[PDB]
Design a protein around this nucleic acid. Sequence first.
RNA 1: GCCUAACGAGCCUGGUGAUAGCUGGUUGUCCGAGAAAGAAUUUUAGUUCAACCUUAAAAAUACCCCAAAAACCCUAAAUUCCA
RNA 2: UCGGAGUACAAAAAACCCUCCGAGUGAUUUUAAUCUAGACAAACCAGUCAAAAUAACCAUAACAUCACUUAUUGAUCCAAAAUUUUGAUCAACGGAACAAGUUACCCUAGGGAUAACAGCGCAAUCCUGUUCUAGAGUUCCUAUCGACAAUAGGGUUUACGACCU
Lengths: 52, 118, 95, 21, 110, 38, 100, 354
Amino acid sequence: SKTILVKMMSQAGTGFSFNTKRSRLREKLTLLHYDPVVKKKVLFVEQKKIRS
Amino acid sequence: KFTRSRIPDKVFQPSPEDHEKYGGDPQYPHKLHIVTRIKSTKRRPYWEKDIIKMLGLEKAHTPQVHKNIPSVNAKLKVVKHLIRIKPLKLPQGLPTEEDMANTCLKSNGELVVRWLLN
Amino acid sequence: VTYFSSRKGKRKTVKAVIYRFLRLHSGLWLRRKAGYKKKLWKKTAARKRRLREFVFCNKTQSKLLDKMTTSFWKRRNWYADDPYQKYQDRTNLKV
Amino acid sequence: YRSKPTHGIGRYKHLVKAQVR
Amino acid sequence: SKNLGGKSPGKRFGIKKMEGHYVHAGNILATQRHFRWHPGAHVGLGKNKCLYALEEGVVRYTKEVYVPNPSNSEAVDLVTRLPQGAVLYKTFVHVVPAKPEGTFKLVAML
Amino acid sequence: GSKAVTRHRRVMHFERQKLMAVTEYIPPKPTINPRCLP
Amino acid sequence: TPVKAGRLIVEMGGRCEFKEVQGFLDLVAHKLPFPAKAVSRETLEKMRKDQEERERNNQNPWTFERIATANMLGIRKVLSPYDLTHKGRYWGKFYTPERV
Amino acid sequence: RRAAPLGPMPNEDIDVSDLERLKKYRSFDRYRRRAEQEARKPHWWRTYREHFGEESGPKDRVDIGLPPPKVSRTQQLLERKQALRELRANVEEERAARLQTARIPLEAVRAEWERTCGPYHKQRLAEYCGLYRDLFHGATFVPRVPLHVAYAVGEDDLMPVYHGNEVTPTEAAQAPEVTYEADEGSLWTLLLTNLDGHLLEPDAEYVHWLVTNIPGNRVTEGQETCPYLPPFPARGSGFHRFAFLLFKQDKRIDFSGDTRPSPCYQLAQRTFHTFDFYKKHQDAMTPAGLAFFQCRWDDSVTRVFHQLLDMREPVFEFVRPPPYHPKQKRFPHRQPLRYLDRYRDSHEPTYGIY
RNA sequence: GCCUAACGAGCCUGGUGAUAGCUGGUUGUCCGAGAAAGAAUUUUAGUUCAACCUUAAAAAUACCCCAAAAACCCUAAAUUCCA
RNA sequence: UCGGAGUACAAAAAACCCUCCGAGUGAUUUUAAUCUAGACAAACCAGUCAAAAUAACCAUAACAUCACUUAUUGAUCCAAAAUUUUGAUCAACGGAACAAGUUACCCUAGGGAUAACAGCGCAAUCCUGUUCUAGAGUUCCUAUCGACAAUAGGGUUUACGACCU
Ligand SMILES: Nc1nc2c(ncn2[C@@H]2O[C@H](COP(=O)(O)O)[C@@H](O)[C@H]2O)c(=O)[nH]1
Ligand SMILES: Nc1nc2c(ncn2[C@@H]2O[C@H](COP(=O)(O)O)[C@@H](O)[C@H]2O)c(=O)[nH]1
Ligand SMILES: [Mg+2]
Ligand SMILES: [Mg+2]
Ligand SMILES: [Mg+2]
Ligand SMILES: [Mg+2]
Ligand SMILES: [Mg+2]
Ligand SMILES: [Mg+2]
Ligand SMILES: [Mg+2]
Ligand SMILES: [Mg+2]
Ligand SMILES: [Mg+2]
Ligand SMILES: [Mg+2]
Ligand SMILES: [Mg+2]
Ligand SMILES: [Mg+2]
Ligand SMILES: [Mg+2]
Ligand SMILES: [Mg+2]
Ligand SMILES: [Mg+2]
Ligand SMILES: [Mg+2]
Ligand SMILES: [Mg+2]
Ligand SMILES: [Mg+2]
Ligand SMILES: [Mg+2]
Ligand SMILES: [Mg+2]
Ligand SMILES: [Mg+2]
Ligand SMILES: [Mg+2]
Ligand SMILES: [Mg+2]
Ligand SMILES: [Mg+2]
Ligand SMILES: [Mg+2]
Ligand SMILES: [Mg+2]
Ligand SMILES: [Mg+2]
Ligand SMILES: [Mg+2]
Ligand SMILES: [Mg+2]
Ligand SMILES: [Mg+2]
């Protein structure tokens, strides 16, 4: 059961990325996070894969 | 492990015969202790050493006068195996200001007020 | 540390101390917490904040760094818009 | 505390048990 | 040999402020691994079961009845299995505030 | 260093030996033996 | 099987007298590791009462129990925390019944 | 070491053995009732109430008041059971109860409450608000006779003054109307006292309206010892208490030391002590009525201070103690850079010699 | 093996006052106080901190410490904190 | 290297090539912010809590939860991304950027701080006696032995310890 480390970039326009752990057998992850630049709940999508 | 010792309360409950045995008043306790360190503090724990130091009993065979209050009685109980305790007796009353320089403490415990007058 | 240089005969300073430390003129030394850029995805927000915060040094480390550095780094600096100019001095120290 | 008179005030496992001829 | 890993430093899980100690706000009264002392008045509970004073005052320790949260299934089951005359008791740590909340001071006559 | 429980009687300190010697039991002794007393 | 001083090992009864039972139990008592005796109810009561009488009519004022509990002469330094309970009658695995 | 308990243990009565045959509660709320009943008992160990001020626990309060009315217990019970039976005999009431559509005569219920058990609730509310502790400091009285006080804030607008109500000084600028049932053979005195608001003496109180020798209910006919003064709470310290004390007296009390002049606009002259007043006139008057309201500063208090009292309006504020900081260290180990800002006098740059 | 009486690699000179956590030595009198080890470490033949200790200087509380207080199945000597 | 229980019985700490369990993470969504009093622990480095105040959700919570929850982890430097982060069975786990075997051909500085011989302590092992008799001895314990057990002594063997060299 190997996981993956993925960097998510905000879709609120401002450049803000955070790293989160995800299962390898999952699809592209998309969640709701907090963006300090705009201070609002913003949809985040998986942009890069960094660590296994 | 070797630690301090708690003395049970029944140890310090005198028997009616003890008053006559040790020459004490069954009604009125004495007012002042005469304490004289006999044994050394060597080969004794540091707490006993410190109690001896704070009681003013650093030098052996030198009597020291103390109160008969429980606050000092606790320390005297702690180091009771290294000291001799007697009651201070005053046949002629407390020394007055004109008799301070002519007093003495006998080995039997009475503090005489006029010692070798003239 | 080179106590006596071979060219000038002066006392030298190690550059690592000045590269990773800052000395206020009051004698205090300021440093960054170790590991503040390592594995941030693995650490709690409170731990990350604690790592991000600046910290001081105790007397032994301060004296060690003073021994390693020279007198040029203990001088009084009046920089233009210095962030630490307010912290350069110590106030209300009752010792 | 063991030496205090109030020791064992919080005991409750003797009131509930949780572990025919 | 066969036994490994038995070495680990103690976590200093114990009591920090005793009864009668004058504490300030935020002082850690006691840290623990399991619930040994429960917080009471003006004593907050951290995420690691530690107890910290919320107001400046004097620390006290009391024995009091224990009414658990009704959402706590385990404690509710224990309570419902208790006999008729049984009441749970726990050791609670309290902070008795010393300073008043504030003072009314004259500023100006208008 | 010997254990608290041994097989060789684990000889005591001299102070303890003196304590036991002092605290040895002393049976009562009548003033006059009663065997061929009246 | 750990065995302490003052414990019974084998218990017998029936329609018999103590003399024969004592006679053939003294061999077992001797062959046991610790010292042992073939006692009866009457003999056990007699020895316990004799011990109590000795302890009550002991003549000298100084006793191990009194000295240990009062910490006279600082003897707790050479004594043991279990000596306050043993009262000087038990020393390691050995028990001396004549020590009051 | 062990210590014997200093009294009975909590769970030492029930038998540990044979728990199956021992009855158990299965209800969390039932356990809650049991636990709250146990928590109020005077246990021999350290408890929460002892440390957090149960107010010396039980206190034998001295009762200075009218005896309770004498009623026949048997007759009252018979009439109450008869009324309950005649109500339950109805079927429309049953239908309303089952359909959950039934209203209540709130005004009626308040009337009987004030008639039969209102005085005790009012007395306990006075205890909670601390009127007795500051008026007599050792005595409590039950307001046996209702006392209805009302201000007139318009032509058809009336502000009632219940026990513990909040009344604006603008609404309370005018003198109020007071009503209480009384026969035409008794004398009464009414006192309006400002408990909190004395600028100088913390333990003293102000007078606002003292009327004495009231014949029955007609208060306007009775002579007024102290002219009415509208409430003047300070701007900073808010929510002062004003208490209406009603005393029933047998004799016609006449005095000259408590009389106030016609203007009566001096705070030095308007200094009062209800304890001293009742000590002076304790033989005749007995307190029987109570009506107290809370009052905070508004836009009319400044006018009262300026025009009437002829002074400058004082302004207070609720200040807080400065934050506590430990002794400053020469070398603060592992402390943030903002450590030096906790002991800074001012956020200004001082150049000592430059 | 032998290479000028010592060769697992000659001898001399220079680097060279090589370097040694290793051994040995370390030169007048008197006086004051005075220490037996917790953590790291290719580290346990050593160093660097802490705790002790010395020399000066500021202060004010320092040890002894009765109650009361410190957990839940049973548990001793006794501990912590305190007038 | 990290954690739990006992050793270490009641504040904290506490060792052994001591006795047992475990970790080098999974599952799920509530994707869990900033700033700052005061504290725990601690040689240092690190680890932990946390009131008040701030922007978004009920206008009444946000400490992510569970698997004994405690351990599920790695410092600088240096390399890479898009400027925000990531990278070590660096597991010898405070980690040297990258290095084996053999020497009886051996050398040097030391160590009785540490082995082989001897001595020394102990007597596991060995050797001597006695106590106890069930059994052999045809019957009969003790003519000769004598199992299961008890107790006392010697310091011949091997081992144990590492006190003098
Ligand atoms: N580490 C340490 N060594 C000591 C201490 N006291 C004496 N020594 C050492 O013991 C030797 C002298 O023994 P003494 O004369 O003290 O009996 C010297 O080697 C000395 O350094 C001490 O307190 N700590
Ligand atoms: N993987 C890794 N290598 C590092 C790090 N720091 C220094 N290095 C060194 O950088 C070099 C990387 O070479 P590589 O192993 O990629 O061929 C190695 O000598 C390694 O020890 C680090 O943080 N991670
Ligand atoms: Mg452990
Ligand atoms: Mg450890
Ligand atoms: Mg030993
Ligand atoms: Mg035997
Ligand atoms: Mg009735
Ligand atoms: Mg040659
Ligand atoms: Mg050299
Ligand atoms: Mg070395
Ligand atoms: Mg000297
Ligand atoms: Mg040092
Ligand atoms: Mg105490
Ligand atoms: Mg103190
Ligand atoms: Mg601390
Ligand atoms: Mg908050
Ligand atoms: Mg290593
Ligand atoms: Mg290491
Ligand atoms: Mg470590
Ligand atoms: Mg060969
Ligand atoms: Mg050699
Ligand atoms: Mg050694
Ligand atoms: Mg050999
Ligand atoms: Mg030899
Ligand atoms: Mg040998
Ligand atoms: Mg030899
Ligand atoms: Mg051996
Ligand atoms: Mg032998
Ligand atoms: Mg035969
Ligand atoms: Mg030999
Ligand atoms: Mg050796
Ligand atoms: Mg050794």
